[PDB]
Amino acid sequence: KISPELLQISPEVQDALKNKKPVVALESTIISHGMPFPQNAQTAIEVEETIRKQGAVPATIAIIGGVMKVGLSKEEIELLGREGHNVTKVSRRDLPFVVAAGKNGATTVASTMIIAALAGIKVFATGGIGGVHRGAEHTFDISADLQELANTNVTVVCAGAKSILDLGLTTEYLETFGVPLIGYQTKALPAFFCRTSPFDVSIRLDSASEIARAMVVKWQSGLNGGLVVANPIPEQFAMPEHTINAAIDQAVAEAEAQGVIGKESTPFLLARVAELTGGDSLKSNIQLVFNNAILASEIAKEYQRLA
Amino acid sequence: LKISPELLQISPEVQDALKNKKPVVALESTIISHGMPFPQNAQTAIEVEETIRKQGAVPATIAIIGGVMKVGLSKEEIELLGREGHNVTKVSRRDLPFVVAAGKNGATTVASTMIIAALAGIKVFATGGIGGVHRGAEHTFDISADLQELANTNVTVVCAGAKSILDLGLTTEYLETFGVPLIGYQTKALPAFFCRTSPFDVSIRLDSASEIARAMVVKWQSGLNGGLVVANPIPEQFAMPEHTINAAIDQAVAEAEAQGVIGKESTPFLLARVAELTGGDSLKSNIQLVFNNAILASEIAKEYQRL
Amino acid sequence: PELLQISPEVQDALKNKKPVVALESTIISHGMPFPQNAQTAIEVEETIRKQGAVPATIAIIGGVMKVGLSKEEIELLGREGHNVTKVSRRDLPFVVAAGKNGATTVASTMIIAALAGIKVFATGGIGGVHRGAEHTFDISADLQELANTNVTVVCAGAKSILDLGLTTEYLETFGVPLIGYQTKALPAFFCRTSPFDVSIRLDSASEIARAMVVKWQSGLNGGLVVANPIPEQFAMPEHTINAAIDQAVAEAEAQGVIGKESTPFLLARVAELTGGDSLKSNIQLVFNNAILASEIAKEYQRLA
Ligand SMILES: *[C@H](c1c[nH]c(=O)[nH]c1=O)[C@H](O)[C@H](O)[C@H](O)COP(=O)(O)O
Ligand SMILES: *[C@H](c1c[nH]c(=O)[nH]c1=O)[C@H](O)[C@H](O)[C@H](O)COP(=O)(O)O
Ligand SMILES: *[C@H](c1c[nH]c(=O)[nH]c1=O)[C@H](O)[C@H](O)[C@H](O)COP(=O)(O)O
Ligand SMILES: [Mn+2]
Ligand SMILES: [Mn+2]
Ligand SMILES: [Mn+2]
């Protein structure tokens, strides 16, 4: 029952929810910190349209002038893409201040889940989830995303956890906190730019339909928390393992040596891997995002059907 | 509070006991499928139900049958889980929605069991031993979802402590961090599962059922959610020799690690291997501790229905 | 029910919408030696009263969760000392069940304040990730209470005996805002500064209060850490205080100190190695935090 001075849902999205059309949420960190200009905004508007061509309704989420806004104008997206790193990356602990100081912010997966759940949106597409960082056994550097997944009822379609992270530790972590890690048509956990990895999802499902069904069962039996749907990047756009892993490993060593830490790590690694791959990691990431948007449209349609 | 009959079904017996305020004791399915071999699996489970019956209390064995969460089971069902063994999905919280959605059978761990018991409003649950922090968890992050269920869900779990195959010190630390009281029953020293003693202490030591119940009531009436571990030492008669059992466990652990056994397979492999190495003795101790735990859990049950 | 009692001076302010600031009893029983423990408690209360707000010291007396306390009960906690049960969240129901007395930690003080509707609470410094928690898993339940329960905790940062870096990672993970008051760098407790930074620098109590109402109205449960730099003149010498802390921790490890008794031991050991100066620094930072806390509580009461 939040006040409009706090949360503002755009009329497209409101109508969508009234008329029970399927809605897919999207995040703003990917635009501001995830990718450079103008690939971030092109990518974002285009993801929105992809969703539209699948017959669903996009709601991109962000903090515009201190307001939590569900659905955004082309203008505001252009805005986040131009202002870029100057915009505040917003996780859970960041949110109330960016709302109070009335500033603009780009929501992470955590925040995007929070707001989406506030708006009653169950399906959310992104590129890759945050997770347990390499070295975390000694650094305790662990995304708030995982705790959000533990606690907030949103399904997040992604290409897995970002492959710059520690995937093994991430899979243990998700199990401890009772979060389903669903492979869409895959048992092997997808690694972001790359289609497989040495690890496993917690369950393989071959259709949106079964995922929607699981969601309804899960929530109706009271098990609160979200679900991760790991969606492999299409073969056309997949980075070959050896190259990408070399660029990731170098970028991670460099970040260690340079004392990069905290909320700045992921943007640093993503950009540096893009430098190291000459733009290829970035192209692949954009491809992965469109793909997840498509699957996410199918899942939301299937979920709305049941609900 | 009202869960659909398609998802959740309580036996008529357990329903009359709940209705008529008879003290009910919950029981887990995974003990049967993944914790013991056949016929000992089904045999022990039925003899446990009987044991709780002698105490003048009503057992509800919990499992997933044909996609339904089932509180209370028939002899046929217990037996089916028993003979089906590893063919039955081991079910933790992350697992739960998919077994139920897909109409399958599943054997519930402490976590799943607690979840379901809590749905039927059963506060007392007897098992052999709880999951915990695995040896090597500093680097592996392998930490049972049981401990998280304990953190949030209102059930008392009577056991011989954590399975001796785990890392007990880190478990005690973990429970403190998460606000879960670890109650030694008539001991300040943490019971070791197969062993009565460990070089680790419980958080509170209490000598009667009634105290345990009254502490339950203050805890919940006060709004601190989460369960309680009541660690009940195996009786002196059936205990394992420190030397022999420890050697068995250590070999088993080194072996599991060397073979690369990970995830939900770890515990069932280690129990099997330990039973093998001890020429079945460990198993016999396990059974005996389960009966003991059941008796104590019935007493706490009566004392709880009282207040 | 009868399992929580609120002093009439406290309820009087709650009903009448006046600023209330919580305090913890572990500062007293296990935090500081007698007589300075009771003295510090009473004078902290006074500092609040004079600040324009109403002190409520939470503790468990005769099994009761008590909001606001008599000087008799304060002297009792200060004197009976380490003989009083230290109470965290796991501890709580039993100390109540058994009608015993206990000194509440930041965790339990947050709980109790929450039961009574007190959104603002002042302490010296919170528990956190201990040095070597990476191998020991030794992590205060406080961090979890901050993750979950809605209370603002004003302090000197985390007690500097702990592992602060790990503590900041952990706070991020669990979504708990770490607010530096007029500082980017995380207050180091005895020290005014640390190699670590907070999550946001806020310069005024009002800002913090608006952040509070916006945070909870939005439904994000969990508390807030407000880190208050120790006054410049009371700060310990970095070399002396860190040499002390380091030795004390090395000893604690050697001697098999663990669990709930780890922090009290180290504190006692540190003031001993610093010949009372760290305790003196400690008492000052507590007063300072009580002042900032009063301001926050007032500015927040104004706003909703
Ligand atoms: C990752 C984001 C999603 N997809 C993508 O392609 N690129 C991206 O940068 C998310 O924004 C994620 O929530 C964010 O990285 C959170 O990280 P922290 O652990 O630093 O909060
Ligand atoms: C242990 C269970 C209890 N008693 C017993 O004798 N044998 C057993 O197997 C529990 O089922 C426990 O939850 C199990 O270890 C599952 O834990 P993970 O999810 O960590 O595998
Ligand atoms: C620390 C307390 C706060 N300020 C201060 O000046 N001195 C103190 O002793 C708190 O009591 C803290 O919550 C306590 O350390 C709890 O620790 P554990 O429960 O982690 O042992
Ligand atoms: Mn991080
Ligand atoms: Mn495990
Ligand atoms: Mn501790």
Burial of C272 (0-12, 13-18, 19+ CB in 10 A): middle
- Contact predicate A188/A163, CB 8 Å: no
- Contact predicate A267/A88, CB 8 Å: no
Residues of A with a known catalytic role? 27, 162
Distance CA C108, CA C67 (A): 12
Residue C31 in contact with ligand 3 by CB distance below 6 A: yes
CA angle C271, C171, B150 (to 5 degrees): 100
**Structure solved using which method?**
X-ray
- Contact predicate C300/C120, CB 8 Å: yes
A131 interaction partners in chain C (CB closer than 8 Å): none
A181 interaction partners in chain B (CB closer than 8 Å): 94
Q: Cβ neighbours of residue A43 under 8 Å, at least 6 residues apart?
A: A30, A31, A35, A286, A289
E strands within A15-138?
23-26, 57-64, 67-70, 88-90, 105-107, 123-125
Residue nearest atom 2 of ligand 2, based on CA coordinates:
B31
Question: Nearest-CA neighbor of C289 among C189, C199, C198?
Answer: C189
Distance CA C245, CA C267 (A): 8
Q: Helix crossing, B145-152 with A167-176: angle to 10°?
A: 40
Q: Is A79 helix (H, G, I), strand (E, B) or coil?
A: helix
Closest atom, ligand 1, to C-alpha of A27: 11
- Contact predicate C185/C197, CB 8 Å: yes
Query: Distance between the two ends of chain A, CA-based, in angstroms?
Result: 21
E strands within B2-129?
8-10, 24-27, 58-65, 68-71, 89-91, 106-108, 124-126
- Contact predicate C66/C11, CB 8 Å: no
Quote the minimal CA–CA distance from C160 to chain B in Å: 19
Question: Nearest-CA neighbor of C226 among C193, C190, C192, C199?
Answer: C199
Query: HEC string of B194-226?
Result: CECCCCCECCEEECCHHHHHHHHHHHHHCCCCC
C220 interaction partners in chain A (CB closer than 8 Å): 92, 95-96, 114
Tokens encoding C40: 């510090």
Q: Is B172 helix (H, G, I), strand (E, B) or coil?
A: helix
Q: Is C160 helix (H, G, I), strand (E, B) or coil?
A: coil
Minimum-distance CB partner of C177 among A6, A93, A148: A93
Quote the minimal CA–CA distance from B264 to chain A in Å: 9
Ligand lying closest to the C-alpha of residue C141: 3
CB contact under 8 A, C218 and A68: yes
Q: How far are the Cα atoms of B28, B58, B298, C26 from residue B10, in angstroms, in the given order?
A: 15, 13, 19, 46
Question: Nearest-CA neighbor of A65 among A13, A105, A117?
Answer: A105
Ligand 5 center from residue B140 Cα (angstroms): 10
Q: Is C69 helix (H, G, I), strand (E, B) or coil?
A: coil
Residues in chain A: 307
Residue the block writes with tokens 């806020």: C202
- Contact predicate C71/C120, CB 8 Å: no
Ligand 5 center from residue C293 Cα (angstroms): 43
Q: Is C121 helix (H, G, I), strand (E, B) or coil?
A: strand
- Contact predicate B153/C116, CB 8 Å: no
Percent of residues in chain C assigned helix, strand, coil, to nearest 5 = 50, 15, 35
Torsion of CA A130, A134, A139, A145, to 10 degrees: 10
Residues of B with a known catalytic role? 28, 163
Given phi > 0 = left and psi -120 to 50 = alpha, else beta, which region is A275? alpha
Ligand 3 center from residue B220 Cα (angstroms): 25
Which of B27, B90, B109 has the most ligand 2 atoms within 8 A of CB, as the residue to mutate? B109
Residue nearest atom 9 of ligand 1, based on CA coordinates:
A34
Torsion of CA C104, C107, C110, C116, to 10 degrees: -60
Quote the minimal CA–CA distance from C95 to chain B in Å: 9
Percent of residues in chain B assigned helix, strand, coil, to nearest 5 = 50, 15, 35
Q: Cβ neighbours of residue C72 under 8 Å, at least 6 residues apart?
A: none
Closest atom, ligand 3, to C-alpha of C282: 6
DSSP at A32 = I
Distance CA A29, CA A144 (A): 14
Ligand 1 center from residue B136 Cα (angstroms): 29
Residue C88 in contact with ligand 3 by CB distance below 6 A: yes
CA angle C228, C197, C285 (to 5 degrees): 20
Q: Is A144 annotated as a binding residue?
A: yes
Residues from A contacting C (CB-CB < 8 Å) are 2-3, 6-7, 68, 91-97, 99-101, 110, 114, 118, 137-144, 146-148, 262-263
Backbone angles phi, psi at B190, to 5 degrees: -65, 120
Distance CA B306, CA B208 (A): 14
- Contact predicate B227/B154, CB 8 Å: yes
Q: Tell me, what amino acid is at A207?
A: S
Distance CA B267, CA B144 (A): 10
Interface mutation target, options A175, A201, A213, A227, chain B, most CBs of B under 10 Å: A175
Which of B27, B28, B194, B262 has the most ligand 2 atoms within 8 A of CB, as the residue to mutate? B28
Residue B28 in contact with ligand 2 by CB distance below 6 A: yes
Residues from C contacting A (CB-CB < 8 Å) are 129, 134, 147, 165-166, 169-178, 199-200, 202, 207, 210-212, 214-215, 217-220
Distance CA B166, CA B164 (A): 5
B224 interaction partners in chain C (CB closer than 8 Å): 89, 92-93, 111
CB contact under 8 A, A91 and C177: no
Ligand 1 center from residue C191 Cα (angstroms): 35
CB contact under 8 A, B145 and A178: yes
CATH topology for the C1-304 domain: Indigoidine synthase fold (3.40.1790)
Query: What residue ranges line ligand 1, CB within 6 angstroms?
Result: A 27, 29-30, 33-34, 91, 108-109, 126-128, 130, 143-145, 263, 266, 270, 285, 289
- Specify the DSSP element, H or E, that contains A157: strand A155-158
Pairing mode, if any, of strands C4-6 and B228-231? Answer: unpaired
Please count the other Cβ atoms lying within 10 Å of the Cβ belonging to residue C167. 28
Ligand 3 center from residue C27 Cα (angstroms): 7
CB contact under 8 A, A146 and C173: yes
Backbone angles phi, psi at B273, to 5 degrees: -65, -40
- Contact predicate B130/B162, CB 8 Å: yes
Distance CA B12, CA B20 (A): 12
Tokens encoding B303: 């004392």
DSSP at C262 = H
Residue B232 in contact with ligand 2 by CB distance below 6 A: no
- Specify the DSSP element, H or E, that contains A150: helix A144-151
Torsion of CA C36, C37, C42, C43, to 10 degrees: 50
B173 interaction partners in chain C (CB closer than 8 Å): 136-139, 259
Taking only Cα atoms into account, the Rg of chain A, rounded to an integer number of angstroms, comes to: 18
Q: Cβ neighbours of residue C274 under 8 Å, at least 6 residues apart?
A: C236, C240, C241, C244
CB contact under 8 A, C89 and B138: no
Query: HEC string of A213-224?
Result: HHHHHHHHCCCC
- Contact predicate C146/C218, CB 8 Å: no
Q: Cβ neighbours of residue B280 under 8 Å, at least 6 residues apart?
A: none
Query: Distance between the two ends of chain B, CA-based, in angstroms?
Result: 23
Please count the other Cβ atoms lying within 10 Å of the Cβ belonging to residue C208. 26
Given phi > 0 = left and psi -120 to 50 = alpha, else beta, which region is B226? left
Distance CA B95, CA B87 (A): 15
Ligand lying closest to the C-alpha of residue A93: 1
CB contact under 8 A, A172 and B141: yes
Minimum-distance CB partner of C170 among A2, A140, A148: A140
Tokens encoding B149: 């269920």
Closest atom, ligand 2, to C-alpha of B34: 9
Minimum-distance CB partner of B178 among C91, C96, C144: C144
Ligand 5 center from residue B30 Cα (angstroms): 14
Q: How far are the Cα atoms of A32, A36, A62, A74, A87 from residue A82, in angstroms, in the given order?
A: 8, 9, 15, 12, 9
Closest atom, ligand 2, to C-alpha of B30: 11
Residue C124 in contact with ligand 3 by CB distance below 6 A: yes
- Contact predicate A98/A117, CB 8 Å: no
Q: How far are the Cα atoms of A258, C32, C120, C284 from residue C280, in angstroms, in the given order?
A: 39, 10, 25, 6
Tokens encoding A53: 């061509």
Ligand lying closest to the C-alpha of residue C103: 3
Question: Nearest-CA neighbor of B157 among B211, B232, B93, B63?
Answer: B232
Chain A residue whose CA is closest to B131 = A176
DSSP at C230 = P
**Cα of C84 vs its chain's centroid, Å:** 18
CATH architecture of B1-307: 3-Layer(aba) Sandwich (3.40)
Tokens encoding A300: 């939301």
**Candidate list C66, C119, C159, C298, residue with the active-site label:** C159
